[PDB]
Amino acid sequence: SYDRAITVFSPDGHLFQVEYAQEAVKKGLAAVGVLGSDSVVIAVEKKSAVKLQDSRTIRKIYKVDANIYLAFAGLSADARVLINKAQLECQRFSLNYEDTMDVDMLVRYVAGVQQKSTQSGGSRPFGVATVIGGFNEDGKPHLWKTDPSGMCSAWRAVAIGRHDQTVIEYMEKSYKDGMSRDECVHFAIKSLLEVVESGSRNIELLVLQYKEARYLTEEELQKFVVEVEKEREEEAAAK
Amino acid sequence: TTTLAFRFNGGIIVAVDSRASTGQYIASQTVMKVLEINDYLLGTLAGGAADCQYWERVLGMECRLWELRNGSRITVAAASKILANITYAYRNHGLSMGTMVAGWDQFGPSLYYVDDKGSRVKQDLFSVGSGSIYAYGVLDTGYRKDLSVEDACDLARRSIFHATYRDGASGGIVTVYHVHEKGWTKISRDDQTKLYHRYFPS
Amino acid sequence: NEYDSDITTWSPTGRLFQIEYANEAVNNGSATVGVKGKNFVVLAALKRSPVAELSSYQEKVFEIDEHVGMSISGLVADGRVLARYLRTECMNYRYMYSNGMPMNQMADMIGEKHQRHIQCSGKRPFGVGLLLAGYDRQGPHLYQTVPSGDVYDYKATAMGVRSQASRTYLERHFEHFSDCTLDELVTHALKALASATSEGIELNVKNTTIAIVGKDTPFTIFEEESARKYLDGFKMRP
Amino acid sequence: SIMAYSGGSVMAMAGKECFVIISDNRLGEQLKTISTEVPKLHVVNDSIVYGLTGLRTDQQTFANKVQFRTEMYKLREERDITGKAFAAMITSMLYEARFGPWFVEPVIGSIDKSTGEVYLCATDLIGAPCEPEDYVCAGTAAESLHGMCEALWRPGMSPEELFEIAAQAMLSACDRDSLSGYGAVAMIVTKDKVTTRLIKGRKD
Amino acid sequence: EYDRGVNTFSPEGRIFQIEYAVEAIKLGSTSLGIRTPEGVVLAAEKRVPSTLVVPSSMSKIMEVDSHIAAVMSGMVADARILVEHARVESQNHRFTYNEPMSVESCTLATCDLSIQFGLMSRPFGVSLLIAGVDEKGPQLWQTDPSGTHTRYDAQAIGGGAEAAQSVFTERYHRNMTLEEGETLAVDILKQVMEDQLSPENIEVAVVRADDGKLHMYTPTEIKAIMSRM
Amino acid sequence: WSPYQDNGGTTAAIAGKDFVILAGDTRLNGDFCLHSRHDQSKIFQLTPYTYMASNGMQADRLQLQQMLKYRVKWYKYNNGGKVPSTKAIAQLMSTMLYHRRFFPYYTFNMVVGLDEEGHGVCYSYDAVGSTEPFLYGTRGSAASFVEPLLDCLINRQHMTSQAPPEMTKEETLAMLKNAFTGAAERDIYTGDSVSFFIITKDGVQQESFELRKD
Amino acid sequence: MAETAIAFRCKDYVMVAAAGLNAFYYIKITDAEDKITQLDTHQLVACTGENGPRVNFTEYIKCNLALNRMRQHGRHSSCESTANFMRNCLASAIRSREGAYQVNCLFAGYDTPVSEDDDGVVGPQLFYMDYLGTLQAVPYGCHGYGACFVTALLDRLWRPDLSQQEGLELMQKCCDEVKRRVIISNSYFFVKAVTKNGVEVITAVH
Amino acid sequence: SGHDQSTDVFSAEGRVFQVEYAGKAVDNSSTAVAACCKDGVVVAVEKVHTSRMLEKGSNNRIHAVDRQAGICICGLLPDGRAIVSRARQEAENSRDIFATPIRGSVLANRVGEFMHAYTTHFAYRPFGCSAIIASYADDGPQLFVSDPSGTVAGYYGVALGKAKTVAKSELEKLDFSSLTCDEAVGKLASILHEVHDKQKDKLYEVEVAWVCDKSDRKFVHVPADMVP
Amino acid sequence: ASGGSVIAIKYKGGVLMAADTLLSYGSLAKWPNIPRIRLLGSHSAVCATGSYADFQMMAKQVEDNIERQKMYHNVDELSPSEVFSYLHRSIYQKRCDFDPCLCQMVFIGVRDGETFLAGVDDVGTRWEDDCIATGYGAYIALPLLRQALEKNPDGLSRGEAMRILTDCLRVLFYRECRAINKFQVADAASDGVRISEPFDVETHWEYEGYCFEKTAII
């Protein structure tokens, strides 16, 4: 096989082919995670409601196993390889150990895989930052972020994709430790609206609670978007 | 060999004899048969001593590696399952190891018989080795789920003893362990001939 | 220079530039000095000299089998690869022949293991130069290896930074080494190694290793209490 | 025997511009019966029907293969496979596992839709084709069916005549076989039309 | 570029990709170790990108075995892959020889992975500072990308690694208390790191010579070090 | 043609508080004859402090002996000079007998020596690799003749009489001489000489001792 | 052979029954080992072999079906499907180095319409499977010593149209026939039925 | 500029530049000289010693390949040893498989095809050395030179290295029909003394080796008494 | 084609090895003119009971490995002890492939005074001693050789060690079926190994109990 070295150091100690995979994330669609007391909320932006794209619902927040969901940002094609590699890992795990694997484990796998690509001859790196949420069997909620370097961190709230720093710099001002299912969703959309188009039809989001995953309908959602876009007219009046 | 574990409210007893006989002649009268893997896991060796002492020591590596990686102790479910998947891959490599992985984790006390043929069974009560049949006799008599730790060890020690008394391949020293929420403790280490003069004083 | 980038490229003037460049990795490694007399070989290796009260051990000398060992210079990574290789091979041998690998035959096994690296595209030359030192039926042998794959059977030599000082010393005295006793060899080996030190610093147990092999002496590394016998009772006078 | 395990018998029969292929309905393990509604015929296209007999595992495995290969043919070649090819394809597939064989005896009926010439093939388990003008059989009732078919069968027969002797053959043999019976499913192929019949026999 | 191959010497004898991977450590977090006779210390600035990050997740320091810790600097991703190898080796040693791995041997087994680049495209962009306790007592070693495992009495790797070696030459003496080493370790990190020092902003972790065990210091315990200063 | 050939002989070890006595007979017997009377291959030094007695097939004892030396000699390099303890080698033997369990070394080993305290210790194996620490032990032809004798004179299990004081290096040797003398007289495949190795802190001290020639 | 699985399929439910008996040689350990695994909401498999191959095969299926539900965005695969997947896996195994999974399954489920567009079988589906991979759709099947007592007792009584209630009465007679007539003490039976609503654990019968 | 970076590449004129370049490594190396007689064959080679402290028989350029055949490398020594290591593998394959001493004619051609295989593929570089194969098998006494290209050619007399030109003039003065193996040692060694630059390479010795009816058609270094 | 039986015995400053010049394809005595004792390099001889085929491959592979190591690298030739260690591992390696060197080798050799005599088996079982035998030699001759070493405990002279071989060879000839009365003797001394021209031994057949009338069943 072709195992020429792709990911290599430059004079300044940068892995160029990873800096460039992170540039493919920055251009990708923004996605957002929010940990609460009892609930995780992963909220992505879609490319925007074209009249053609199937009325039958396609979900941009991929299920990895019952407990664990992930949103990505970057190259759709690559992400769909990570997800099918994780999905596989979670069931390869259930076979080897009777346990359902916990979030903090699967993240470290997906991260490990994203790393292998930054150090394999033949491969470029995956152009995919990954926001994994989910609940352990014990009851604890977890949110994590895997960036293309392979380096994983766990967050209380987080963004990836376009203007990821603008969202995180906005989030860490207004975030509060203990949050309810409704405050979390409110906050997730609030944070996404900093960067995403004013519209409510692009934002799709998922609310993980213990043993209970539910995507918001575009009816449930537009209540929280009117409630939030009136609060971004209260924060525009002050300044 | 005789080797029995059982589950009660207080936790899990593991009792064993201490003899490794090649049919007729007795090699050793001091075989430590309760393998101490983690500090919350007791493997019991019966059948091919070689295969157990090796695989239950591998299991121990995998249990510790899990503790490092996942920053938290393995379950007994998963511990037994690791052993079960090693014995399954080697089922037609002529392994021989009737093991019992006992332990206490998040989900209460758990006992798992794990065979050579990849078998893996959640037992409330179990006995392995030539003298099992004898242990089960005594053991199914006195065994309730609401024993005190005193009476559970009394029962197990008798059960092993009454296997040592009948089986020729079972004998030596009747070791008992207890598995509690705080780990495992070695209760006793009584010689089986002293035991006869306790249980039948005349 | 368009010919210096790959191992496989000959220059138009017929030089394998990437090997000449691996040879610079040896000359920038810390000085070591070997000398052989009638019965004994001596490797004196300059370690890194403690910065104030702060120490730094780096494995520069290696035992290889009872009857052989190595000083190295340059990329210590690559030296540890050759140490591993030679050890594997001297065992492989002793396993087969219930006797240590002859030194001439070992000289040739590192000559070949170097060359394998300097012709393939994927591989690079070893940055390390060795001072193989050992004793067998044919007396004592000191060998200097080099990245190019060349193997030199030396009467004495140095290898590393300011080693041209050490060889200038050894050139005066190397003829009298067959005569000299084990203690006189070590003095000569250190006096040379000392010629290589920077400006004002001295040799002493904490900044120098000696190692010996010869008749009835298995290859032994002297650090600290062992070496003081030679090193406390030593000074460099013009 | 591993062939006699799952039981079954199949028989094909050539008339004029028609053939009748006819299985039994039994599926067993040795003497004990599982099902009495297991016909052994599969239909590749309009103009080919093949029975498989032997170890049911492999009947079912080797069937799913033949179905995968005759579909991949129908896409790549852009046409229905012809008896000739299909039968020779099956020999190639069986012989691919000369050592470690499929325990299956494919009986193949076929009829060129243009010409109207019938083609039969009774491959043994390692793909030894036997391609007679008249009729072919396989499975547990094979000895008994050769006896029947040999007496009853004449050359240029018409679909209805043929069926009645193919049915009498398959039945009057499965009376004398432990491991076949519970009626029979015949299948009368013509250039024109394909008549599938479920025949009533013994419950034995 | 891709003009020079991976396995390529400069005109002054250093492999390029290594010389470069070493300049990838001088960007990373500052991390340091102090070999006192009472026990060995490791401390590391976490350099959290935001407030929001659960600090306990992105652990600069890692249990390799009971008796060995690693601290890393540079590419954290790559360090996970070294430490993961070192763990497996530490346990293979325990499995095979019923005893703790040495610290020296655990550091050698971590440069058995760091040489093999041509199977892997590039070196690891990471310097490990492995510290533990065995029969030799408390030892501190450093791996590079090169593969050059070097036992130190006290070393700092990372951002202000060169500013911290300035401080060590002044303050470090072989006969330190474990208490003096912790105080030094955190005194240096404060002077060197970019952010203001908090209990959450760094991790400290020591292996004590007496029990030969690793204790990762909780933010309560790190505030106890910032107290006496 | 059988790839296994039992080359006979008997090994014994007794661990006191300071020392270990390690005995292995020098009869190497083939098929119905005897090849040698001065075969020293039974016992093998791995380190100053640690020895490995080995019975059954010679050829495998000799392969294993090297294989073990070249994992000890590797341990020496990787753990900077330091020699492995008895307890390390003991688990290494178990690990290396098992990696070959699908074509076993037909060799019943005993790794014998001093632990870190100085207290003497011996471990026994079966072909596959089953470690059991013991205090007194005996594998081979005269397993059955020696091991009951030792069981009586050390443990004194069935005696009313007060247990004897401790048992010194010279008494434990004198006991083993007496035992082997009573095994050569009564077993056919034991005889010629016995090599004793008395491992203490001070260094090994081997003294070969004569049996019945037959 | 020791441990008897029974199953039968009527108008609007499949009923499945499997020995509790967990045996080590000739020793009853317990009479409370559930051998009917649940592969889906609407699909379960009465597997009866030695514990090792029974678990390692019903886990491998249960995982590779869950893995399909992930990759197919919550779509619940038909019974025909998993049955043919199970058999394709059992068949693959008799021509590998491993050897046959030595397990006799009675795969049972209830295909519900998965969306608006579904035209396929609505209703209950029972399949008999040998260890070799002999898949076969059946009205009622059995595995184990008791099988042939029950198989004939069902021939007699079983009609295709009986209630959920007449299925408890029948499954009791099937279970009680294995108790009367087989030496091997299959003395407690786990009975699970599949309906439109899902799997329900029948505690009434044992 | 790209026409010369690899051996996988002809230039427009139709020559492999990387092979001509390796050929320049031979013509900057220590001069070797050999002479085929009726009696046998002689190889002399000047070894230019870098340091004064080298042993006698350090950087031995002449190597026994089999009993009857030895190579004398001229060029990059380390490369040459890879040739010798091969030539050996071939010479012993001849004894193992075909039960005979390798013919000199074959051994040269076997070594040519080896040195050639490294002039074809991009991955490899051509060999830096010429080899001088000197055999005395059943095909009589034979002298052969495999150069970096893989171009074998049989010689009576041959000169390689930086003095090649002047050392070849002195080989033409000899009568090859007449001379014995005992004269030849003296004349080849006399040649290497005469051509060698005294100001450039102060430290040098003249390693000589032969194979002839004298040495029992066995390839050996001549004793140090015959050399001057 | 099998070899008969080898005997060897150390004397003062050397070793004698002796072997019938006969290969035997089963019962049949096929070739009575085979030199069974081979020289391994300049110091050592070897000889094998069993498959002359598997000995011809092992004695070839070893005699190569010696004259290679010597000719290639400028080293001392291997000592007998080494050559024999190489033979021993080469044989053990072949029993560990289930492709055994199905032949008991005896091996003699002398470097200086250093006098080396060893046997090896099919399976790698190796043993030095002051007298070796393989084949029937082990059951017959060894008893006599060991008796001649017990009686001269200081060591045998070359004349005594030759007479005691000749005695054993005479007895091997009488009692081993697949033997002939034509032996060679290797003699390792300081100078190296010399193999004797084939010789027969004097045989006594005219006992008064071996006459016709006594041995008659009737």
Helix coverage percent of residues of chain B?
25-40%
Which pair of chains has the greatest number of interface residues, and how are they split between the two chains?
A: C-H, 38 and 38 residues
Terminal residue distance of chain B? 28 Å
Number of strands of chain D: 11
CATH architecture of chain B: 4-Layer Sandwich
Domain count of chain B:
1
What is the terminal separation of chain D in angstroms?
Answer: 21 Å
Task: State the secondary-structure class of chain B.
Answer: alpha+beta
Remind me, CATH topology of chain D? Answer: Glutamine Phosphoribosylpyrophosphate, subunit 1, domain 1
PDB class: hydrolase
Keywords: Proteasome 20S subunit, hydrolase
Entry title: Leishmania tarentolae proteasome 20S subunit apo structure
Chain A: Proteasome alpha4 chain
Explained architecture:
The structure is cut from a larger assembly and holds 9 protein chains of 9 kinds. Chain D is α+β, with helices and mostly antiparallel strands and 204 residues long. Chain D has 4 helices and 11 strands, in the order E-E-E-E-E-E-H-H-E-E-E-H-H-E-E. In chain D, the strands form 3 sheets. Chain D has a 5-stranded antiparallel sheet with strand order 9-1-2-10-11, covered by helices on one side. A 4-stranded antiparallel sheet of chain D has the order 5-6-7-8, covered by helices on one side. Chain G is built from 4 helices and 12 strands; from the N terminus they run ββββββααββββααββ. In chain G, the strands form 3 sheets. Chain G has a 5-stranded antiparallel sheet with strand order 10-1-2-11-12, covered by helices on one side. In chain G, strands 5-6-7-8-9 form a 5-stranded antiparallel sheet, with helices on one face. In chain G, strand 3 and strand 4 (27-30) form a beta hairpin. In chain G, helix 3 (147-157) packs antiparallel against helix 4 (164-181). Chain I has a single domain (1-218), classed as Glutamine Phosphoribosylpyrophosphate, subunit 1, domain 1, CATH 3.60.20.10. In chain I, 32% of the residues lie in helices and 26% in strands. At the B-F interface, strand 4 and helix 1 of B face helix 2 of F. It is classed as hydrolase. The entry lists the keywords Proteasome 20S subunit, hydrolase. Leishmania tarentolae proteasome 20S subunit apo structure. Chain A: Proteasome alpha4 chain.
